[PDB]
Design a binder for this molecule. Structure first.
Ligand SMILES: NC(=O)c1ccc[n+]([C@@H]2O[C@H](COP(=O)([O-])OP(=O)(O)OC[C@H]3O[C@@H](n4cnc5c(N)ncnc54)[C@H](OP(=O)(O)O)[C@@H]3O)[C@@H](O)[C@H]2O)c1
Ligand SMILES: O=C(O)COc1cc(F)ccc1C(=O)NCc1cccc([N+](=O)[O-])c1
Length: 316
């Protein structure tokens, strides 16, 4: 119903945002422009997506056009794994700010709990293909994130792909100054995340659901993989409500008090995906969608499975 959710930093965050991972650099400027024109006020970004400059061109044009005011936008980015060291965090944030052509971010996330060796490569590997870790722990990285708030570069800080023990580690940090505002995690009917969501919500941490449509454009997709958009059970719920399957998949997390960030570069779908504030899934619909859980996780890497902070060995 309401378009924004209150964060534990006192700011309001739009519950629907536009995802930008895999949005080609030659298409994402127009995608973000269209999104803002049709009502989006939250854009999910990351340095590792390699398209923040182009996202920034769109944001700047719409600000210049006075289609929107800066205070009305909620721009999110993420600290990549090769910048977990305390001496690199500010520069990483500043590069993102410069690319997005902003003087602050609304929310800055630790992208993954796994720190990697700094350098040009986003995934530094040893000769056998294991990622090369950094020895910097999540608590010291968190302290560096807190400094960004105190310097005015970001309004809120949070985490992404943290399991419950990792969230707990932050919450139990000696001398914790700012709690994480958000944990952004994969969540959809095949990976419903009940345990981790309940834990985060119980601590006042807002959960953002990524890959809500199952990321059908993920580069490692296989033909035999399950497909949310094609699941006849979900299509049936959509048909009953006279909505598209994507619209049901977006409304689902909204009714769990989650923020959701579907990605599209297709103008018609960008508009479609925003038309989700005028219908309600029943309790029965919600429980039925939850029943489709199969613990099917699309976003994880074999190269990281021995990293000490790999998040997905733990149940949740
Ligand atoms: N924190 C993290 O580690 C993390 C990880 C993954 C994702 N994310 C964030 O979450 C965002 C969303 O996740 P995602 O990109 O993995 O996948 P997604 O939003 O689940 O799915 C995107 C795919 O769905 C298609 N699509 C969109 N709307 C549609 C509609 N109405 N009908 C049919 N197909 C539709 C898109 O096609 P077209 O674009 O061609 O229209 C694209 O192929 C990402 O872009 C990123 O911002 C964060
Ligand atoms: O991480 C995201 O937001 C989406 O996925 C990616 C986007 C990119 F632009 C580049 C890489 C990825 C990707 O492989 N992301 C997956 C990933 C990253 C880091 C650590 C782990 N891990 O399992 O520990 C997994």
């Amino acid at each position: 119903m309401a378009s924004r959710i209150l964060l534990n930093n006192g700011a309001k965050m739009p519950i629907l945002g536009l995802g930008t991972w895999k949005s080609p650099p030659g298409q994402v400027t127009e995608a973000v422009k269209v999104a803002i024109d049709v009502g989006y006020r939250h854009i999910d970004c990351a340095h590792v997506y390699q398209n923040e400059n182009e996202v920034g061109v769109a944001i700047q044009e719409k600000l210049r056009e006075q289609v929107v005011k800066r205070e009305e936008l909620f721009i999110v980015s993420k600290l990549w794994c090769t910048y977990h060291e305390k001496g690199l965090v500010k520069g990483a944030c500043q590069k993102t700010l410069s690319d997005l052509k902003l003087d602050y971010l609304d929310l800055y996330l630790i992208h993954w709990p796994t720190g990697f060796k700094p350098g040009k490569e986003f995934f530094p590997l040893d000769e056998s293909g294991n990622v090369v870790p950094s020895d910097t722990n999540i608590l010291d990285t968190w302290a560096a994130m807190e400094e960004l708030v105190d310097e005015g570069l970001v309004k809120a800080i949070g985490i992404s792909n943290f399991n419950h023990l990792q969230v707990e580690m932050i919450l139990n940090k000696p001398g914790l100054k700012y709690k994480p505002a958000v944990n952004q995690i994969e969540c959809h009917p095949y990976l419903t995340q009940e345990k981790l969501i309940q834990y985060c919500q119980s601590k006042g941490i807002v959960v953002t659901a990524y890959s809500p449509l199952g990321s059908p454009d993920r580069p490692w997709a296989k033909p035999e993989d399950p497909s949310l958009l094609e699941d006849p059970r979900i299509k049936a719920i959509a048909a009953k409500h006279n909505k598209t399957t994507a619209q049901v998949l977006i409304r689902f997390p909204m009714q769990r008090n989650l923020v959701v960030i579907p990605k599209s570069v297709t103008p018609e779908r960008i508009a479609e995906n925003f038309k989700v504030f005028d219908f309600e899934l029943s309790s029965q619909d919600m429980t039925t969608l939850l029943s489709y859980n199969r613990n099917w996780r699309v976003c994880a890497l074999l190269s990281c499975t021995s990293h000490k902070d790999y998040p997905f060995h733990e149940e949740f």
